[PDB]
Design a binder for these strands. Structure first.
Ligand SMILES: Nc1nc2cc[nH]c2c(=O)[nH]1
Ligand SMILES: [Zn+2]
Length: 376
RNA sequence: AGCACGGCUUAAACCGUGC
């Protein structure tokens, strides 16, 4: 079985569908990877996650590092064994926390010093350390250590941040390659930065391509610049990346975001939207989002979504789920999440099939229509 | 507490607005 083999089977405009073959499994693309930060996809058993259609879930480096600890998971047999998910797992470097936890952070050329957001203890997360942790966890797709540049950002900050990241990228590549045990079984992705300035984006892309990575991700987006700006940056950023390699857009969920991103060449997505919203009561459907807490659902026997093939939608009504979330019942979170994730998978199935039939561009158009119409 | 809603792009079974 191959280590990492990306193959495009169909194309349409910038969009394309295919698969990534890895030792632990195959990953159909475009793909959506559910987020399982602390060694768990919130409120779901691994089998449930797999049931929705996911081929790969994602774990977080910074968080697992703190709890239950990298070395400890390594000792317990690795992340896969630990949480009960044997298919490929992608671990994020922690470069996202560098931003979301800025307040508790202290940056330096060596790496970023984090103050445990739960222990107060100090921790040095350098490119090398980030890669060692990912090795200890035994992830299949390793992410380079980077700094998800905050937004807005002056061309100056965005440039220094990006350049330090590219240097961090090289260090990551070296850390990865130092362990043959790792380099022979995992895959390494680099992350492109540069905020919303294309000259910077190009520059970052070139550094990345020079070092050489199994896959290239685009970071720094969906961080407050809005969909218009995002799609605009993607317009020129994705083409700067190696066409024969997979393109990964980090932290991007929200039905229409994904569809547009795919129209621009993205192959992979990861986002907390479906799981967090599921927990808060927000369900995603072919007719836009719907807040199940709303009064109009107290006696609505219909399922969350009319088309949805998901297990929740085959059995329970909006009325039951309404009651649940309102009551504070955990089953409520469970049901909501399973649905949002199966829907995200069904949406990905659709996006893949349309590209195969050469009628994706259309599918996108019909999608927004119905979605933004909100007749659920 | 509760009600009517909103937000969410893992320090979030959360946070906010109005009664
Ligand atoms: N490492 C990393 N993770 C994420 C997640 C979302 N955006 C980013 C990013 O720019 N870098
Ligand atoms: Zn469903």
């Amino acid at each position: 079985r191959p280590r990492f083999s990306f193959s495009i089977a169909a194309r349409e405009g910038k969009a394309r569908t295919g698969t990534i073959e890895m030792k632990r499994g195959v990953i159909r693309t475009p793909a959506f990877m559910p987020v399982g930060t602390a060694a768990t996809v919130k409120a779901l058993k691994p089998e449930t996650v797999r049931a929705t259609g996911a081929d790969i879930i994602l774990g977080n480096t910074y968080h697992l590092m703190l709890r239950p600890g990298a070395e400890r998971i390594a000792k317990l047999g690795g992340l896969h064994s630990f949480m009960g998910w044997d298919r490929p797992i992608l671990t994020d470097s922690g470069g996202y926390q560098v931003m979301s936890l800025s307040s508790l952070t202290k940056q330096s050329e060596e790496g970023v010093t984090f103050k445990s957001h739960l222990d107060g203890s100090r921790h040095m997360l350098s490119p090398e350390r980030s890669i060692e942790i990912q090795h200890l966890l035994g992830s299949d797709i390793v992410m380079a250590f980077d700094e998800c540049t905050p937004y807005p950002a002056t061309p100056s900050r965005a440039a220094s941040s990006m350049e330090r990241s590219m240097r961090w990228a090289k260090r990551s590549r070296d850390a990865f390659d130092s362990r043959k045990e790792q380099a022979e079984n995992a895959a390494l992705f680099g992350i492109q930065q540069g905020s919303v300035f294309e000259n910077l984006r190009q520059q970052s892309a070139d550094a990345l391509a020079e070092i050489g990575f199994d896959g290239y991700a685009v970071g720094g987006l969906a961080v407050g610049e809005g969909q218009d700006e995002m799609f605009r940056v993607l317009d020129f950023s994705v083409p700067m990346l190696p066409d024969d390699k997979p393109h990964y857009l980090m932290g991007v969920g929200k039905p229409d975001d994904i569809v547009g991103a795919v129209e621009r060449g993205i192959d992979m997505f990861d986002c907390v939207l479906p799981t967090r919203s599921g927990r808060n009561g927000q369900a995603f459907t072919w007719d836009g989002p719907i807040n199940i807490r709303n009064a109009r659902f107290s006696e609505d026997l219909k399922p969350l979504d009319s088309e949805c093939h998901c297990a929740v939608c085959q059995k329970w009504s909006r009325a039951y789920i309404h009651h649940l979330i309102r009551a504070g019942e955990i089953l409520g979170a469970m049901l909501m999440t399973e649905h949002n994730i199966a829907f995200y998978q069904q949406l990905m199935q659709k996006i893949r099939d349309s590209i195969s039939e050469g009628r994706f561009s259309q599918f996108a158009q019909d999608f927004r229509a119905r979605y933004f119409a909100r007749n659920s």
